[PDB]
C-alpha cells in the first residue's frame, strides 16, 4: 500500500519520500481518487518533496484523475461523504468549484495555491503553463493578478517562441516535405512516407543498388499524381522537366532517353503484362543509361480495405509526424518502435496485394507502400477554398473584380463532391455553380471593372448567387 507515499507527500515528510523511492516507487504515482504526489505537494505548498519529486523525475504535466466529489463519487459508486472527506483531507481544504478538477496539472494547483516558488519550480522543470484542464483553462486561468501572472505569462511567451523557432527548423530540415504540405491538401502521412524515403537514400541508408522505388495504393484523384509531380518539380528545381507518367490500363525507353534521372509514374498496373513488370524489374536491378531516377506505381487494390479503417492510418500519421518534430535518442528509438502500418500491410494487405500479384518477390524490390487516405471534411473544405481563391486571383488580376464568400458557401460546395472523379469533382462544381455565373454576369456586362461580388447562400435546394455592393 503506497498510501503512505502520497500521505507523505502532503505533509512533506520528506525523509519517508526519499526511503520509499529508493525501493523503486513510481515518483508519479496517484491517489485512489486519482491525484498524483506532486499535485498535492504542489498544493499544500511542499516545496521540499516537490523538488524531490521534480529532481527525481517526476512528470509535471500530469493531469488529474479527479473531476468533482459528485461525479468521481459515480465513477466508483460510493456515497459522496466518503469523497469529500478524503478530499478534503487528504488533498485540499482550500479548493470551492463544485466544476470538475480533472487534467488539472499541479501548476494548475500551485496557481490555485498562490504560491509563487512552487510555481518556479514546476516551470524551472518544464511545466507547461498552457496546459489545459477538461474546461480548458490553462494555469494562468486560475492564477490571481499578481508576481505570479506574470511569471507564467512569460511562461507562456517562452514555450510559444519555442514552438516558432521548432516550425522554423522543420523548415530548414525538411524542405522538400514542407513545399509537399504546402502544396497539397490533406494525405499526411503519404508525403510522410515518401519524402522520409528520399532522404533516406540521400543520406545514405538505403542500399545504392537501385533508385528508389515506390507503391501508391488507394483512390484515384486524391493527390497521387500531383503528389508525383510536385516531387519531380522539387528535385528538378523546374515545374515541367523532370516527370514521365506511363498507362498501364493501354499496354517506353525514347522518353526515358531525354532526362535520364527524371521522376516516373505507373498507373492503374493492375492488368500490367507481365514481360513489361520483368523488363520494369529488371531495370530496377540494375543500356538503360538511368541512375537516381524515383519510380512509382499505383493501383486500386485493396482501396476498399485501405479506406476500411483509414482512422488507424490517419493517428499513425499525425502522431509518427509528432516524432519528425522531437530531436533526442530517445525519440529515435520511438522511431525504431514497429509502426501500425507495418502490421496493417502484413497481416491485411500483402497478401491481397500477393494473391493479386503472384510474387512474393515483387514487394521486397519496392522500398516502401504509400497509403493514400478519402478527404476529411476539413479537406474537402480547403479543395473548394483552392479553387475560390483561384477564381477570385484570377478575377482581380484580370479585371480587378473582388470575390467574397464565407464558410456557408465552402460547406455548400462540398455537398457536390462525388468519389469517382475524386478531387476534380471539386473543380467542376466551382466552375459550374460559381465561374458559369461569373462569364454569365461578365458576357452580360453586369461584372464592371473594379466592382466587389459577395457569394451568397439563399434557402427557401439552396442557391448561390453573386451579389453586387
Given at each position: 500500500k503506497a498510501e503512505a507515499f502520497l500521505e507523505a507527500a502532503r505533509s512533506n515528510d520528506?525523509?519517508?519520500?526519499?526511503?520509499?523511492?529508493?525501493?523503486?516507487?513510481?515518483?508519479?504515482?496517484?491517489?485512489?481518487?486519482?491525484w498524483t504526489a506532486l499535485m498535492v505537494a504542489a498544493m499544500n505548498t511542499q516545496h521540499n518533496v516537490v523538488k524531490l519529486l521534480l529532481d527525481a523525475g517526476a512528470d509535471?504535466?500530469?493531469?488529474?484523475?479527479?473531476?468533482?466529489?459528485?461525479?468521481?463519487?459515480?465513477?466508483?459508486?460510493?456515497?459522496?461523504?466518503?469523497?469529500?472527506?478524503?478530499?478534503?483531507?487528504?488533498?485540499?481544504?482550500?479548493?470551492?468549484?463544485?466544476?470538475?478538477?480533472?487534467?488539472?496539472?499541479?501548476?494548475?494547483y500551485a496557481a490555485l495555491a498562490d504560491d509563487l516558488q512552487t510555481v518556479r519550480l514546476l516551470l524551472d522543470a518544464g511545466a507547461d503553463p498552457?496546459?489545459?484542464?477538461?474546461?480548458?483553462?490553462?494555469?494562468?486561468?486560475?492564477?490571481?493578478?499578481?508576481?505570479?501572472?506574470?511569471?507564467?505569462?512569460?511562461?507562456?511567451?517562452?514555450?510559444?517562441?519555442?514552438?516558432?523557432?521548432?516550425?522554423?527548423?522543420?523548415?530548414?530540415?525538411?524542405?522538400?516535405?514542407?513545399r509537399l504540405k504546402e502544396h497539397i491538401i490533406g494525405q499526411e502521412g503519404?508525403?510522410?512516407?515518401?519524402?522520409?524515403?528520399?532522404?533516406?537514400?540521400?543520406?545514405?541508408?538505403?542500399?545504392e543498388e537501385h533508385p528508389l522505388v515506390f507503391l501508391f495504393l488507394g483512390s484515384s484523384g486524391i493527390g497521387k499524381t500531383e503528389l508525383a509531380k510536385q516531387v519531380a518539380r522539387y528535385m528538378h528545381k523546374d515545374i515541367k522537366k523532370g516527370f514521365i507518367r506511363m498507362d498501364?490500363?493501354?499496354?517506353?525507353?525514347?522518353?526515358?532517353?531525354?532526362s535520364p534521372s527524371a521522376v516516373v509514374l505507373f498507373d492503374e498496373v493492375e492488368k500490367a503484362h507481365p514481360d513489361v513488370l520483368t523488363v520494369m524489374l529488371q531495370l530496377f536491378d540494375e543500356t538503360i543509361e538511368?541512375?537516381?531516377?524515383?519510380?512509382?506505381?499505383?493501383?486500386?487494390?485493396?482501396?476498399?480495405?485501405?479506406?476500411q479503417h483509414a482512422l488507424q492510418l490517419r493517428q499513425e500519421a499525425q502522431e509518427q509526424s509528432r516524432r519528425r518534430l522531437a530531436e533526442n535518442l530517445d525519440d529515435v528509438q520511438k522511431?525504431?518502435?514497429?509502426?501500425?502500418?507495418?502490421?496493417?500491410?502484413?497481416?491485411?494487405?500483402?497478401?491481397?496485394?500477393?494473391?493479386?500479384?503472384?510474387?512474393?518477390?515483387?514487394?521486397?524490390?519496392?522500398n516502401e507502400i504509400v497509403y493514400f487516405l478519402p478527404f476529411c471534411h476539413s479537406e474537402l473544405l480547403q479543395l473548394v477554398s483552392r479553387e475560390l481563391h483561384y477564381w477570385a486571383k484570377k478575377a482581380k488580376q484580370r479585371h480587378n473584380?473582388?470575390?467574397?464568400?464565407?464558410?456557408?458557401?465552402?460547406?455548400?460546395?462540398?455537398?457536390?463532391?462525388?468519389?469517382?472523379?475524386?478531387?476534380?469533382?471539386?473543380k467542376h462544381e466551382v466552375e459550374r455553380r460559381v465561374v458559369n455565373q461569373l462569364a454569365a454576369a461578365f458576357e452580360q456586362e453586369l461584372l464592371p471593372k473594379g466592382c466587389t461580388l459577395r457569394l451568397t447562400v439563399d434557402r427557401d435546394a439552396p442557391v448561390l448567387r453573386l451579389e453586387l455592393l
Open positions: 520528506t525523509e519517508e519520500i526519499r526511503r520509499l523511492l529508493s525501493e523503486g516507487l513510481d515518483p508519479n504515482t496517484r491517489h485512489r481518487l486519482g509535471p504535466n500530469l493531469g488529474d484523475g479527479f473531476s468533482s466529489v459528485y461525479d468521481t463519487a459515480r465513477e466508483k459508486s460510493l456515497h459522496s461523504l466518503e469523497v469529500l472527506v478524503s478530499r478534503e483531507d487528504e488533498f485540499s481544504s482550500r479548493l470551492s468549484s463544485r466544476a470538475s478538477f480533472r487534467g488539472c496539472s499541479a501548476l494548475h498552457s496546459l489545459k484542464n477538461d474546461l480548458g483553462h490553462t494555469p494562468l486561468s486560475y492564477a490571481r493578478d499578481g508576481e505570479l501572472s506574470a511569471v507564467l505569462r512569460d511562461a507562456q511567451d517562452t514555450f510559444a517562441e519555442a514552438q516558432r523557432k521548432r516550425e522554423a527548423e522543420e523548415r530548414r530540415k525538411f524542405p522538400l516535405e514542407r503519404a508525403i510522410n512516407t515518401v519524402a522520409s524515403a528520399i532522404r533516406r537514400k540521400e543520406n545514405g541508408w538505403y542500399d498501364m490500363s493501354e499496354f517506353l525507353t525514347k522518353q526515358l532517353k531525354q538511368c541512375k537516381d531516377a524515383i519510380f512509382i506505381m499505383t493501383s486500386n487494390a485493396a482501396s476498399d480495405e485501405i479506406a522511431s525504431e518502435n514497429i509502426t501500425i502500418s507495418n502490421t496493417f500491410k502484413e497481416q491485411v494487405i500483402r497478401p491481397i496485394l500477393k494473391a493479386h500479384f503472384r510474387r512474393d518477390e515483387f514487394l521486397g524490390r519496392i473584380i473582388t470575390l467574397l464568400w464565407e464558410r456557408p458557401v465552402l460547406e455548400l460546395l462540398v455537398k457536390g463532391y462525388n468519389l469517382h472523379y475524386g478531387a476534380r469533382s471539386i
